[model samples]
Target: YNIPFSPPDITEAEITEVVDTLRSGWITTGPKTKELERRLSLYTQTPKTVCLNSATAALELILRVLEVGPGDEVIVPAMTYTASCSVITHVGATPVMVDIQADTFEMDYDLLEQAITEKTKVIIPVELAGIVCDYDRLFQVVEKKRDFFTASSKWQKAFNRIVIVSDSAHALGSTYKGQPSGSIADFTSFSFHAVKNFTTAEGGSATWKANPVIDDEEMYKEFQILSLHGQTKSWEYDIVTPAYKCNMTDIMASLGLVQLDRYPSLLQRRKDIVDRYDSGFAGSRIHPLAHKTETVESSRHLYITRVEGASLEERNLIIQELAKAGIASNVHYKPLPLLTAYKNLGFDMTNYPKAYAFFENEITLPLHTKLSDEEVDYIIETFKTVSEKVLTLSKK
Candidate 1:
């Protein structure tokens, strides 16, 4: 049996929800979308929530809502997908890329404040592969910058620090010291993409940390207006801001609702798969991504493995060999600086050595809920033999 990579685990329930939404006639953003936002608010324990077309829109929403514009700097990790840093650029703010930790794919907290200055408006700590960055350390860094941060609004001064917009696209179910994604950041964006563990096919949501100073209801209302091209009612409305449209459709929300209902079992299944992979590959040449700690629990999204001593060419060869065996394997990302857009913007990969080194030997295995035990076992066998053969043949 051939094992494919990361297929969507859709079921009859998902189809039923989509069909129900189709018959309901309100296919656009309306009651279902509103209800999904409400459910997400309770799920994340954040009073305010906004569901959008994509996580990219959710991230850009935070920047636009906060008036983070030109001449401002947003500290972003060099180790994440482009969405994390691209939103900063979308707002015309500078994305100051900080390097990551050598062992784990998390943001290096010690290097955070070094990127801060008077013009720093935001700090984006990405949760790469569902294992989050250190929330405690990130918050502490912002608090330490009180003497350095220049407040642009009452909201900025009210927090007494820089805004932390979490790139939580891979971290919907993850926890840092028992606190989930929404509880820690000023704003957190989650992607329910087709490939993500918890998917709404193609959807996203934004949730904010609890704030006593700011009224949550009013902020939620502002987001509602912002997402729908500044509309408040059917006939009468105000164009409060020059905003682009990115609203979540009811059909998408219907799918999201079913996924949410099934999430507990889904999470458990993903964890079980991860445990099996970890146990099978223990003390081997494939170094799995550093996930799990005493107090933290990851969402167990991607199963990334780096070849023990393999070069970039060897890594690709291993992937090719897996494909020949009818198994699908891929890479999570090439760090932003290595991409054409960032390179054109004057980012050099050599400057971010750790990011480059991590990407070079990294390969993501086929991980999803749809695989049977026998299929998983076959994949493990294929990966083990293929990786070993490639590693042995690598000359110096």
Candidate 2:
């Protein structure tokens, strides 16, 4: 059977849930949405949850709620998707780009501490491929630099420190040091896009730990106002802030609720796929991305492997060969600086050596719940045979 890459796994259960929601009268941001938020809050054990149209909106919401603006600076990893950094720029804040650890492609802690200054307001630690960051070390760095943080609002000053906003787009079920992604970070955002492990078909949620200065109840209320055109009431509403429209619909949330229910079995299927790939590539020329640590349990969202000693041309050829064999492969991401948008802003890939290195020969294999045992075995055999056929070289 031909194996495609990262298809959405929507079963009959999801179809039934969507139909039920459609049959209901209220569609936009109603009881189903509220229930989804509550379920998310309980699952993550985070104090509060706010379902939104996308994870980008959730990140921006935290920035605005904390009053981050033009003169402020936000720390963003050079290795993450554009959304993690783009939201900072949209809020008129400067994005201080830091490189990643060569092995894990995670934010470099040494570089992170060096990057902070009086202008720094928030630090967004991204969990690439569901592999959680070293938050304990990150937390220590922020605490050491607490005196240098320049708080812009009364709410921000209450913390008396820099805020940690986790870009947990791929890590809804991931755990770090026995703590799940959402609870580990000070404030975390999750994505339920079509390709993610859990899909809301273009939806996301933001969760935050308890803060005495501004309780979670207040945080939830503020999100409601910001998401609803800053209107406090239906007809008698007040514009608390000039907020954008980005709220989750009941129909979308209902779909997600079913996915969450079915994830226990679904997630295991992804794990099985990952294990098969890992065992197949164990002694081969393929090197998997540095995730799945002993202390960190990744959600196994993306199965990224790099061809050892392969040049960029060779890497592209492997992907082409896979397509010809009726199988599909992908690249997790191209470093931001290499993209045209970032280049236009004077970002140079040369500056981010680690991120560039990771992207050069990396290819993501198909890892999803939809694949059967036979299809998974075919993908493994195809990859090994294809690589040896393409290159006569050996790294191991």
Candidate 3:
């Protein structure tokens, strides 16, 4: 295949940084990781940031830090990856899966408000495909339900309502209403996995908006204690609590530093690719998700395209045909309820019909920096031809 799904756009600078870290002798979660955290804080315009081994760790630690447990509930959209919902269960909180809007793949706000209860501690809205969700409505929903919220922890008390934690795994550089994703959400987590727009091979970060009540230094220290097996200091090595070890290594952070430096250009390339995709698919059945709108400027992570009128079988066949044509394509998601894990957790696929509808015809095209203009054009041509054939055959 001329097109791969999503490869890391690592440069020689990243390689040099990693090698420099290796020779520096302090490779564990040290200077490089700290620098990445500081840079990310600046990048997102958030008060503080904590680098971790994975986005899963970042979300889990946020839950743990907030003291969310068995009795609490966390709201997540059915249209996101398992990491978004799994972290809820990891923290012993019941996940309330909400369906997405048929057009936007964003959690249906009406359903979101309906799902809120006294036990609802956090709302983890996913910035799927790097699109910033409607934070205005999200805030309105939480504010309306503030009477049901009871503050139990120091962090929870700071907000005095249901916490909005963005699973912005795909939205590092996205903005909504001129504010960055991290700043928009009360607390946000980002992934730096190889397949993501930014690559650290495997790493993530947790950050929060500055609050009048919450001390930034204190919150950062708490995250540090939680991620590194509760070690108080480097010299004494005193264990504060039996916490998990998921700290970002200097090697991973080294990649992140270079990635961050090169991110603006990388994002521009993605926007250009998306624009080409939009233009190629215009007046056709191929519908790509809107990356740029009036208020939202997405990181343009995945080119989530849908074959309008495609069924489950037709969508799968289209992907297969594209594969034969040397264009690797994929589905953005299979609604969380459709999965065995969620089913076992008492979520029925039929209950999330809107999410299912979105998934049935969804196809994620290759939208990485690696894709050349010619390759993108090739994908457009191949997709149109393959899809028309599939649709015509299905009609027959």
Candidate 4:
């Protein structure tokens, strides 16, 4: 009766694809990887997309391409993966952590005005829980600040615009306000990790919106070169700029191609599970996380629930109880201020009360396409049993 938190929905089709790639003698970044990028662009309705080895690499590549460096400031939500903030530091820039909304685990657009400054170069709005943030409001804020913001230190113009780079790692097929997540911002990064809805073992990608200011084809070429040592020509060995090796192999993209084709069915299954969980948790202390809107669809990558009156310790105890029942539940994340690295960076946890409040009681239950009806029932029942017991005992 053991239910794992999240598992890859790998099938023989993915297996066969990889096997075919290995046998084809072209296992490196080749036509298959290029095809995956093209399909991603079509799927996300973006003008260009580039596959990379990981989302961390994709985020870093965007920052590098935009020339964000020392003394620059990148706005990131306080409640996100460390990779999001770490990329800012890696590029020698300061990460201005902002709090998320009380309901949805999305960025607080109201705080954007306070976070933005003359040094702010990029705004990385993370799409946590596969729910897109309010991009319309974000665009308005950026537009208002465009006259004050600059692209890079190299470009010292008064009318420089701030780039909106979306960390959409969990939002592959998710849509926001009738538009896809990938096309919501200036640049978007997606993950294909083992636990993600779409997986390529360990891979990620970057997609860009159609920019009238820059050539889309040239941007794609620049990404390809940047991902592979920044060589002017593929055949010749001339190093134009120092770059990191983060290219996606054909083997990884081969799996990604099949996964993309099968994504719709997979999304449906996840939605069904979410409905079941929603019904099961209703009228109880467990509450569902807020999403974009009724019209907006999420990828449903993780089923997050909160204990209404429970502390962080009680939440951990509930996770322990679930583990004893052979159900592996986990937490989405800890607030960045709570982390040691962020603390040293002078980010105070008390400064972000709402973000910490959300994290204190949150627990991410198992929500993948692989769970059966019986397993889902078992998990719900076990959670109810453990929650009731913990709540009663804590009252004493």
Candidate 5:
């Protein structure tokens, strides 16, 4: 009955590939990584993808590639993980944090539009918990604000408007209006961190939508060279710009190749699990984030549930009870403004009331492939019992 949270779903298939990679001797940043990139491009319907060491690296590189540096503004939602905004500061740009909608935890589109300025270069809308953002609305916002856009860089001029870079770390298989995550935004960064549904054991990728002004091959090479210490392998040992070293190794790619091969089945299992949980929680005060909707199909990464009428303290007690019952639960996030890092950056939690409201009651249930049906049922029963007990206790 011990349900651990989000264990990596590794199998012998992945082990074989990793073993082969170890014996292959060309292990670091070679064919397997390139193959994974190509397969991911095909999967996401994007022109190309660049494998990186982490989603954080991918985001930073996306900003670097677009020349979004000091004095530029990148709008991010306050409800997401810190990686969503930390990359902006890493590039020496200011992160303009926006508030979220009370119901969806998605960025308030009106506030997002108002946050744009002549200095605004990118909008990093997070596809939080594997649910796609409303890309149609995001694209419209950028277009309406186009007159304020200033294209000071080559890639910037390609779009000639504020770019929409999706923080799709949790949204690999997710789609919006029939468009896959990578193809929906100007650019997207996906995390393959161990906890993610599709993982490469500490890896990630960056990809962009097809644009007429850009050459896909050239863009791939640019990412390649930048990620490899800026050595264009016309590398008679020449460093282009003293860039980063965040390329994916074949060892990691080995896991990814097998994971990608098995992903459809894996995703299906997750959906089945979610459906069972949905049925279990139906008509209860505990409400979940929607994984399937008329306009979107989620990757089913995290099972984010909000305990209605529960304050932050009550939510903590519920988590404590679940843990005591041999079930491990988690919180997807605390709003960025509530964190010490963002507070030190002068962001006030008071400004993001809706983001805080969502966080106070949010609990992430363990939704992974390793969970047996029995464990899930146990969790559901225990969650309902503990949450009710905690809430009733709090009320008195």
Candidate 6:
């Protein structure tokens, strides 16, 4: 009856792949990693893809490559994981925290213009809960801003090209407006962490859209070198620049290859589970977060449902109740403005009212491929009972 929140879906094929990798002798960033990058490029339909140790590293590297340093600012949604905001600081740039729409939990385009100023360099639209953001509208905003800046003084020339970076850690298999997540933005970063739909233990990849201006292939190579200590060649080469080591190993890539092959079936299972949860919660207070549109397919990375008339404390109580019933549940995130680090940076949660509203009542349930039917049923029934109990207690 015990249902864990999220567990890695490792099959026999994954086991064999890891074993083969261990026996291959060359287990560092070698052929397998290169093969994974190639496969991801094809899967994501992007001309370039680079694998790294983690999505945090990938985001930071992209920001670094784009030269988003001191005095520059990057806009990001206040609802996302800390890594989304932290990367900006990692590059010594200021993060302009923006509010999200009430329904979709995506960045509020209405507030985008207000948040932007002369210092803004990039806008990171996060794909929260596997739900894709409105890139069409976002692109339009970027283009309009670029045109406006281009007409301004010579100082505005660099800011003229407002890059759209996608924080797609939870949206690897997702598609937005007939294009995959990887190619949806100027730069997209995906997480392959253990809990993700597609995992490589602890790895991530970056893909770039058509950026002919910067030579996408050269950018990819630059990142590869930067991640590996900035050497022109291997270990024997002279160091051109001191870079951090953030390369993915062949062992991780071995897992990534099999996971890619199994991705479709895994995604289908997650969708099935989501459908079941949707039906189970129908006519109840809990509801699914708004998606982009029916045509936009999500990766279904997490099943986030919000309870009506529930406070953060009540949501915590319900989670405890579910744990007592052997059903483990969780919350996807706390709004970045609510976090201590962001708060200290002078970000007020009041600025992101919609994101905070979603966070107060939201609960993330177990939705991995490894979840069993019986366990899923147990979780569903237990959630209903606990939610009802908590609501009734509040009424009393």
Best by lDDT: 5
lDDT of 1 by residue, 246-325 (tens): 89999999899999999879889888888888888888888888667775788888898887788888888999999999
Model 1 clash pairs are none
Cα lDDT of model 3 by residue, 198-223, tens digit = 98889999999877888999999999
Better lDDT candidate (3, 4) = 3
Candidate 6 local lDDT, 292-348, one digit each (tens): 366678899888888888998899999899888988888878999888999999999
TM-scores vs. true structure, each candidate: 0.97, 0.96, 0.98, 0.96, 0.98, 0.95
In candidate 3, position 176 carries an lDDT of 98
If both were scored by lDDT, which would come out higher, candidate 1 or candidate 2?
2
Off by over 4 Å in 2: 393-396
C-alpha local distance difference test of each model: 0.85, 0.86, 0.92, 0.88, 0.93, 0.85
Mind giving the per-residue lDDT tens digits that candidate 5 earns over 18-96? 9999999778999999899999999999989999999999999999999999999999999999999999999899999
Off by over 4 Å in 4: 153-159
Instruction: Report the CA-based lDDT of candidate 6 relative to the real structure.
Output: 0.85
Worst ten-residue run, lDDT, model 3? 228-237
Residue 147 miss distance in model 2 (angstroms) = 1.6
Cα RMSD of all models vs. native, in order, equals: 1.4, 1.9, 1.0, 1.8, 1.0, 2.5
lDDT of 1 at 23: 92
Off by over 4 Å in 3: 234-237
- lDDT, candidate 2, at 347: 79
| Model 1, global lDDT | 0.85
Candidate 5 minimal-lDDT segment of 10 residues:
231-240
Model 6, C-alpha of 301: deviation from truth (Å): 0.3
